Point group: D3
Chain length 234, copies 6
């Protein structure tokens, strides 16, 4: 059994969804999974397994920052995870992106040290599994939920980045900022597993808060659905 996500074989499922917030996790469990079960809760890393249209699905809590995610991801794989999709939030770096809108992450600028440490300092292009990426983009499109398809950025210092610094990054193709996608993608390739990431804009960089409960909450919901449907596909 792992050191963090203390689970034994049989708990985790093939397809797994990775949420940073232990809350959204639970809310996913109770809201989309039949007879959801919680295999782990150690370190607040709440994780559940239930069924979605029969198919076994999982929902494991990564935490905040590629370091924590990496630890959980690495362990979910050792436990049996084959298809993991991130279900999180982000901070818009532009203005064209309004809160609640969804983003299918094409790739992730590695502004984190975790991927760096794994790459021993080498450059890289973290990208999801083309099948998963394709799947998310397709279930989104099929469901009719307006979205965006592009780049994000996985930083480490939440309060370091400034609106201005973000404006510049946007000129490079970055749409918003998150804190786990880059590592998910690296390990994804590194360990021979398919990974993906879908994000809900919960605010624009420069402002001290999230979005009017309902606006973002729908997003968080649309996102979670597209995710689930995509995995069952891959």
């Amino acid at each position: 059994s792992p050191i963090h996500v203390r689970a034994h074989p049989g708990d985790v499922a093939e397809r797994v969804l990775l949420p940073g917030d232990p809350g959204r996790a639970e809310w996913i469990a109770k809201t989309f999974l039949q007879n959801p079960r919680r295999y782990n809760d150690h370190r607040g890393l709440w994780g559940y397994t239930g069924l979605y249209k029969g198919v076994p699905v999982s929902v494991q809590t990564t935490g905040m920052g590629t370091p924590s995610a990496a630890i959980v991801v690495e362990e979910l794989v050792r436990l049996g995870a084959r298809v993991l999709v991130r279900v999180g939030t982000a901070g818009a770096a532009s203005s064209d992106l309004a809160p609640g809108e969804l983003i299918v992450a094409q790739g992730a600028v590695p502004l984190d040290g975790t991927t760096r440490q794994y790459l021993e300092g080498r450059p890289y292009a973290p990208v999801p599994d083309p099948e998963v990426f394709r799947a998310l983009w397709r279930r989104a499109e099929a469901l009719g939920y307006p979205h965006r398809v592009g780049l994000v950025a996985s930083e480490d210092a939440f309060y370091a980045t400034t609106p201005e610094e973000a404006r510049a990054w946007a000129r490079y193709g970055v749409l918003a900022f998150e804190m786990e996608a880059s590592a998910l993608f690296l390990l994804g390739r590194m360990r021979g597993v398919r990974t993906g990431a879908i994000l809900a804009v919960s605010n624009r960089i420069g402002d001290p808060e999230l979005a009017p409960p309902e606006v973002l909450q729908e997003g968080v919901r649309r996102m979670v659905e597209v995710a689930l449907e995509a995995v069952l596909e891959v």
Copy 2:
């Protein structure tokens, strides 16, 4: 008129293919375009323009390496380019990819100094325009030629990379090595244009001479077809 690609106000089309070998360029313009016209030969950077299935299409030689390629791209853009797709060759990072196989660049691991100079040393994830990428994958499917979808890596010292080094990069998801994608993908986002890349494996890193030219020429043809069909998609 641009410094290198000395084309005029009305010579370049919105949809352009970017081969590195001026030789391949000319061949495409003759084998696929109607009423083909060479608008430039300065510096051996042959660029042709004509009609493909009633749609205006251009073929511009980029040369080898991102330094050469960024100059050409930067100039195609101020010349009208809007959809630029790279039709090139690459060396497989490992043995699971044979010569003549197609690779649809999902992203490019930036091991070049050109993107490094443009990004002032900042990390980044050179990825194509999702739309164009999506197309390339579909026409590759439609036409039904043996291919792959994933990461390639753009290097600078062609003769630097060792077979041992390549295989390590393979353990990071890189399927093959080439010398342009990265910058194109970068400039694409920087100058708001949709770009893409499709490569035809011409050898496995470590070989003295490329494999049977008949098998590589056919690989090339398939690539150019997909690419041309895909540019009409966007």
Copy 3:
């Protein structure tokens, strides 16, 4: 109201202890604090407050990795924290440190990208607040608890570091490897608060499992005693 540690001024007491996993927080709260009040549980960042020997002391969850620890320390500062000491666990890099022993953080070798992004590439030497450091030190002696005073390393990739890399680092002085010390020390100076760090060696790098539960809890128990007594002396 912080964006992550959804609290309010008055909830957090000047002197604060910072454990990595909430489970250990609760323990400390319920165990050493009278009338403990968990003012936050958002994102699993369990944060309590209560009386210790007649002085309001707090217990805040940082999460794993300096990225998560950064946000917590950054908000704890916005709420009114002045004396923040981390009470954690680490993996010994040397073959001389015994499981269950204590380590007073004289400094933290910055091997994480959080501190890095906050410094913008600049070289630094992350150290605690002079006094706190001196506090943790003088107590651990008056309390006859065998401990060590020296350097620890702060990393992002928990599973990257192999025993061999660890011994190498031990040659420079790294006693063990943890994951929150550096950014805590950094922010200490950056924000103006007094920080510190004491740790419990839970294992020897490269090993899949800790040692006898009994020993590891008495090491942590001690750690908090040596800690709580200090935050009051400064």
Copy 4:
């Protein structure tokens, strides 16, 4: 036979001039070489060999950029090149250097990524072969053609540097910018062959094109003469 310079052993002399643009290669071959013969035109890398004052000399196109130039040089040495002199143009980094003036490159600040790949990121000082360097200088004086002797800078991204950043480098001794020298100088030392570089200023950094036509040409003619005289001396 090499991959890019499809030529046989005896198709290349011991002494070689390396112009970046194939049109000048051809011009040189015709304007200066006796009984010159084109031994390659693959990928537009026009290469001619003939006699200059009874001695054989080759004029080989390198292409734009160190990656391309590196490939060319590597194969040339494989082909028997022993003395390679780059004969190209450059953008002045200061208002004192006027179009047409010549520059005997004493060294090249390595702003390119090719050298870096070969240097695995180590610092370095790309300098020519002392004997070659001195002959160029000497002949320039012998021919009474005015010139400058100093550093040039080799970059990757032509359109990245601005009039500001360039003259900034001037304050470090950078006379002008180009895109091949550094890789040539490094490889000269790595493979053990004598290399040198001379340049015809084609414009001042900040201008949309170049200067008055005849001026530059007379500069190029002098440049090639100096280079030709020199290679026969070493």
Copy 5:
């Protein structure tokens, strides 16, 4: 015998004060040492050995900059040195450190290349030996002289750092700029010896000369005393 400090093993004592200027060494040796004798004067690295209250103590010159300092510290270790304390001057980075004030070095920010070459580009936290650090501190209060305890930055280019950049560092907690501590501390750990540093502020970066001849000299004296006492304990 060592290449630079040409002394005999019996010459260097266990405890050693490390002044940067040979003028201060000679002074120390003659002001505080009983029956002092110079054991070396090669390369002007004046080194003296004497008795300070029954105990033998050496005062070795290091020169300016970590390269000179590292050469010295390395050879002193090889000649039996166990405890080395740097008694140098420094430049205030902020306005709260009027010259004459004392600084007990807790850590030294590595802005030098000596520690960079040793560490092989790896990050680090140069710090003194705990017990030695503790001693200096205690003796300063004991003897009762106004002092400050914190960080100092070790740089290579004295005339580089500008008045602004200093305040920029002040914001990360740098108390002053000197030129040796970092390497002394790194070697301290590598070669297993006890090192420390107590500085005497001489100016405020951006200063052309110095301050009141009177003040600076008194501060220096106290310094040498806090240092001489200290070493006696450890």
Copy 6:
């Protein structure tokens, strides 16, 4: 009055030789200069100004390391120094160079932190002033003294380079290792003065000492002689 080199205006000549050893300075002053007169002794940085064949010339100790030399060069130039040439020692990188041999420094690989601080981490090619570089070479020949022409490597940590690494560097053209060239060369350009460096090989990297004192001394005498003839040239 400069801070370190406390010389009055007019004490230092236009031409100056730069030995790193104050013992060598005095010897040079009293060996080759007519009417030698020391103008500074502060910090063992011995400085002399006498006459060489009627021409005023100064010899100024730089100390060991680029941070030191950098300081003295900055100060001499501010004093009026115009032609500064280093006359020092260095250890051969391979069996290619024997003790007592002269090296005319064509360029200096910057492995030091000083040039890196000035340069702000940017790549660079430290070269001597072209005319001075030439006069040295020119005088080397006329005098009949056996010498090599090429690269050296200016490093910071004397005791850090392994014999192995020296060989790795030889592969890239580095002839020997020393500790001042690079900075002297960067300041040369930065401050508009003419510089150069001639070296006497005193050993091979690896050996714990030096060669036969009578062998090296003649190398030193030839070195100085060449430099003196040279400085009068420009």
